[PDB]
Write an enzyme that holds these catalytic residues in place. Structure first.
Site, PDB file in Angstrom:
ATOM      1  CG  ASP B  64      22.956  14.448 100.194  1.00 35.21           C
ATOM      2  OD1 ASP B  64      22.755  15.685 100.191  1.00 35.21           O
ATOM      3  OD2 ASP B  64      23.574  13.870  99.266  1.00 35.21           O
ATOM      4  CB  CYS B  96      26.290   6.848  98.118  1.00 38.30           C
ATOM      5  SG  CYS B  96      25.540   7.898  99.378  1.00 38.30           S
ATOM      6  CB  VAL B  97      22.593   4.207  97.498  1.00 33.66           C
ATOM      7  CG1 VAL B  97      22.053   5.622  97.713  1.00 33.66           C
ATOM      8  CG2 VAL B  97      21.551   3.244  96.950  1.00 33.66           C
ATOM      9  CB  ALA B  98      21.667   7.876  94.077  1.00 33.77           C
ATOM     10  N   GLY B  99      24.909   6.686  93.589  1.00 30.66           N
ATOM     11  CA  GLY B  99      26.171   6.960  92.915  1.00 30.66           C
ATOM     12  C   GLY B  99      26.979   8.049  93.604  1.00 30.66           C
ATOM     13  CG  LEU B 100      30.301   9.196  92.705  1.00 32.40           C
ATOM     14  CD1 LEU B 100      31.062   7.911  92.997  1.00 32.40           C
ATOM     15  CD2 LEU B 100      29.308   8.951  91.581  1.00 32.40           C
ATOM     16  N   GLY B 101      27.410  10.311  95.685  1.00 32.67           N
ATOM     17  CA  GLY B 101      26.663  11.048  96.681  1.00 32.67           C
ATOM     18  C   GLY B 101      27.568  11.815  97.617  1.00 32.67           C
ATOM     19  NE  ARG B 102      24.556  10.435 100.682  1.00 30.00           N
ATOM     20  CZ  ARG B 102      23.898  10.266 101.824  1.00 30.00           C
ATOM     21  NH1 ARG B 102      24.191  11.021 102.876  1.00 30.00           N
ATOM     22  NH2 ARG B 102      22.942   9.350 101.911  1.00 30.00           N
TER      23      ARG B 102
END
Lengths: 152, 152
Positions: B64, B96-102
């Site tokens: 990120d 991604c994981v935590a939400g959208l992110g990249r």
């Protein structure tokens, strides 16, 4: 003397004038309404006479069969961004010495940066020059990645 | 679950599924007709179950606030060149994981490479995500120079 225009740009690709044909060269450049002339090759003529006719001369030479650096691509590209907005319907002239040589290379750049795929550009220019671009140069244009920062 | 489409491309940007919501996640991805899922973040779920539904999972993670290398940009861009021609009207999922992110970062890339100026792309995506892209990422997209080798 090949003329090529796209969008709001218009370039003239000429032959290096002789010390004796310099007066007409001007007379002509003036006709096409050129306000700038970029020499991508060796300089072989006193420009003080040209400058007096309001036609500034730029000397950004770059080795044949060798990509025009990055500083030239930037300045040239930026010259195009300004000049044509700055003075509507004007023309920018570009020339080498033995005839064309690599002039086409920068015009191709303006075209590509102008939203034209490299082949599209090359073809568009050969339409007027036919013998423009050699194998080494084509390769250059092929790997060129445009900034794509010219608004229209 | 933001869906964005341009030209012949159509991507889905989802949230990393839980070990317990994996069955529905599939059911959904299947609905949107996704045939590929690219994980640009950490992998937290056994894909053998997804692969069995014909939905191959690619793991091209990239740090990120750090541009997705050059190998990823190439493979991803190339995945887009093929998949959509290969299977008309299909959808490619990215998460991604935590939400959208990249995730948005690669879709933005497909858009730009697709002939959209970076801002045009960013705006087009915010239309659907609104909170997509952070300051560091925007900078990335701004300095990105597209290959412009996707025909349409």
């Amino acid at each position: 003397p090949v003329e090529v225009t796209y969008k709001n740009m218009r370039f003239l690709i000429t032959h290096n004038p002789t010390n004796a044909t310099l007066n007409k060269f001007i007379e002509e450049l003036k006709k096409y309404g050129v306000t700038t002339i970029v020499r991508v090759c060796e300089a072989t003529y006193d420009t003080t006479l040209v400058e007096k006719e309001g036609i500034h001369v730029l000397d950004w030479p770059f080795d044949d069969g060798a990509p025009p650096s990055n500083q030239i691509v930037d300045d040239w590209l930026s010259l195009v961004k300004i000049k044509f907005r700055e003075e509507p319907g004007c023309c920018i002239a570009v020339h080498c010495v033995a005839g064309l040589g690599r002039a086409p290379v920068l015009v191709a750049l303006a075209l590509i940066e102008g939203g034209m795929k490299y082949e599209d550009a090359v073809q568009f220019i050969r339409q007027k020059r036919r013998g423009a671009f050699n194998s080494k140069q084509l390769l250059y244009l092929e790997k060129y990645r445009p900034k794509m920062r010219l608004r229209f």
